[PDB]
Symmetry: D2
Subunit: 266 residues, 4 copies
């Protein structure tokens, strides 16, 4: 008769999987991911930090770019995450096995990471990846320091319960550059109202808009560069059109409000 | 330029995914999986036991067959496993969420299950499934009793470090039937000799052939029915051609020796 | 010379460890813990719920009281927690091993439970207990249903990041009784201001006072009965002097404010 | 009436907790634990390895001795274990938090470590310590190499399911020294015969005697130095009276046979 359906792999736009050479953002901060997925390398005197890794199959590419930057596997000290979905935390388990790197995350992100994105609040087991363990649990506003560089966590629950923005201050042209790596504020295919798995979803997103709006934010980056109007393929002008954190939050709220009204109507 | 490859789904023969109605093996023991993947339900006055679940997408089918048998989600007390690969432990995480079932497994199987099959000794992150936790760790030869049915664990390391044969005694026509559910003895695509991730692999397989050969074994069942010459689609003659444990072990060892020789030649 | 210090056991007032017989709170709700530690049994047509277990050594006493109430180990379906410290979650690992029970908790409580209370934000490894795994992760405001009885989670972060109040509606004398089991609002020996491990501690406590104040709350219970003016030894008048949730929140805020001012001065 | 007993702390002989300065064993290998508990530091041009940590409260002492040796927290790459009981794995969780160290262990040791020693086969929740996660799972005979020092795992199940002997080759006076760090072969207060939690306990001990007897073993070291006739307080004659592996194995088996006979008599 009719068999159960085959499992479906998590397939994405080609650009999400398109390798690029390292792109410098500030004196110590580089984009080393793909054209359309962010993975940020911060090189300190005392080892490197990686913020996000992209899709599961990006591990060897990341290590290659790291090597190009003079960062050996042993030199990678810390992995931080925007959120623990397959398209941003995908290669974390493998990176941990192949490098010195330890993971710091909040409790929500740690739990979701530890089950490889299964039992997702909105998509169940539809998009999973290799599970990984967190080495350190961080609280809202807590700082982590590597080679003198201080990273601050700003919780912005919504896209996932554990969604986080990370901020740090680098330099460029002799001046301080307050960098804000803000997580996604999308809700793709989510039930927003009366969601039994996330009863306070709407209130969390609204709080998160306010949080993003107030970040210290000379330069905004996002896990999907298009979200902050970055174009990693545009070389010298990659970041020209980048949004402020204020504009990013406002656009995300407007979009959310639209989705909420369409949900009410449908 | 060329993007990284898309993730590839773990796809299998249609017959592995073909639902079947419950097929009775003995007075308390039923096959409730698919045509070509074993999932054994043992029904007792004191609750039910499931040995293996098959592929990840089989959870709801298994639950329907349990219901057809009179077993509600609350009635399922225990899940046991042959080994913790995606095609036998696939749906375990989901079943734990949807029923009262707890998992008992040996340390090796528990650790691989908790990884959702990632970092496999032989296939790395190639075939993964939703991670699950064990509630009880069992030792070689340890018994678990549910409603008077006594399950004994016989470690048979090789196909996985944690591969296990489960034996118990049921009845049929008022006479005892010693059932042996023996794990796979295959080594599909494995490097057998000088494998740094499994240095004593060959010695473990050889001990496992001996173990399987000696099991109490009026009736042999295997995770893949074809391995023991079962035909779940053959109705009242489903088990007619079934191998003895002795014959299963001898065939597996002969195949294994062939593979070793081929490996040496290649 | 001078050896390192011996490990120090977690010792508590005798009353915390003084067994008591089950004390009925409402038609289906009983106190089955000790004189000075709460452990609530809710008996439904479809199995029992336990809210908290007290100290690690209380497991056998709890099971005894359960048996006295006609609840066999198999009948215990669910364990919920106020917070994952040794004096309330202490026996959870052991109860899981000895019963059918599964644990539901928020991500913060799950993480702290999973490391047996080690690496505590305020007391480090000073007070630990056997670790246990959560079977289900709940979000703020999410409900769980057992035998038709609905339990609602209300996050009240502060005493621990994952501190939770649980509410449900029982009956008594033919009338509905909205029961609120509110977690501790104490901060014993905590650094409140500028705590690097908990930067937003003060803001969370203040939000939690507001949450407790607004609970549906015909009857308030607390993990330490003295906190809500319960006296479990006073038999027929055990709950006579019990505070409202509003009064409990107000007293806790007044105490907090006092501690904050004393911290500023010292 | 009579309250439940207070929790009892895991207290030990003062000499187990007596700090000592680093004692050199061979060119790269140092004892850096206490007088009566082994903790071995292996220093290489490519980072350091720690085998065992001793009791939970020894973390800071170990870190001071590492510093004295020139090993900073970032330099510690790897922790290996004899077995995962409180008196040898005690401080592992804390060391992981405070250094760059990752843990490699076999599945059995990993599972017990992840439980912080709770649900022990023989002592239940009687002696527990802070839980820690393994970063790498090793198989019998698997090698791990750090800075040219090659560590080989030899499973010797018995004292714990996961008990391991670690062997490696160091130098002294320009000649090779084959060091064997053999786990305990004791069974303190164990039920040996017909133990339902460990049905093949005796057969495992006997195989382990044979394994230890055959180790490459110019110098034997043991978690408890007295077991191999080491005297860490004896300076330049600390290792003079040390047993061979052959003699250690024979003494352990003789003791074991005595215990069996006593058990049968009692
Ligand atoms: C990647 C993923 C897995 C499960 C549920 C949601 C998502 C998702 N995250 C983003 S950003 N866009 N889609
Ligand atoms: C399903 C799987 C994942 C990883 C390695 C091996 C296997 C596999 N198990 C069996 S039985 N046939 N192939
Ligand atoms: C029990 C415990 C362990 C660690 C830190 C705090 C506490 C504590 N919880 C309560 S309520 N009173 N003291
Ligand atoms: C420390 C411990 C905990 C539980 C069971 C046994 C032991 C123990 N290990 C050694 S060596 N001597 N006693
Ligand atoms: Zn996402
Ligand atoms: Zn994304
Ligand atoms: Zn397999
Ligand atoms: Zn298979
Ligand atoms: Zn507490
Ligand atoms: Zn308390
Ligand atoms: Zn021990
Ligand atoms: Zn010991």
């Amino acid at each position: 008769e009719v068999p159960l359906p085959q499992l479906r792999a998590y397939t994405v736009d080609a650009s999400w999987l398109q390798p690029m050479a390292p792109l410098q953002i500030a004196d110590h901060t580089w984009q080393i991911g793909t054209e359309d997925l962010t993975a940020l390398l911060v090189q300190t005197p005392d080892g490197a930090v990686l913020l996000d890794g992209g899709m599961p199959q990006m591990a060897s590419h990341l290590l290659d770019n790291m090597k190009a930057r003079g960062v050996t596997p042993r030199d990678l000290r810390l992995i931080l995450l925007s959120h623990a979905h397959a398209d941003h935390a995908g290669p974390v388990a493998e990176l941990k096995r192949r490098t010195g790197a330890k993971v710091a995350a909040n409790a929500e992100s740690a739990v979701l990471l530890a089950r490889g994105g299964s039992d997702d609040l909105h998509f169940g087991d539809g998009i999973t990846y290799p599970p990984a363990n967190a080495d350190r649990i961080v609280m809202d506003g807590e700082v982590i320091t590597v080679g003198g560089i201080v990273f601050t966590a700003h919780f912005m629950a919504g896209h996932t319960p554990g969604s986080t923005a990370w901020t740090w201050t680098d330099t460029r042209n002799g001046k301080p550059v307050r960098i804000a790596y803000a997580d996604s504020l999308s809700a793709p295919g989510y039930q927003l109202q009366g969601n039994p798995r996330y009863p306070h979803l709407i209130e969390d997103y609204r709080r998160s808009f306010a949080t993003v709006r107030a970040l210290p934010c000379d330069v905004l980056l996002t896990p999907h560069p298009g979200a902050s109007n970055w174009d990693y393929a545009a070389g010298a002008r990659a970041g020209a059109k980048a949004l402020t954190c204020k504009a990013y939050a406002d656009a995300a709220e407007q979009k959310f409000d639209g989705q909420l009204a369409k949900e009410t109507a449908g």
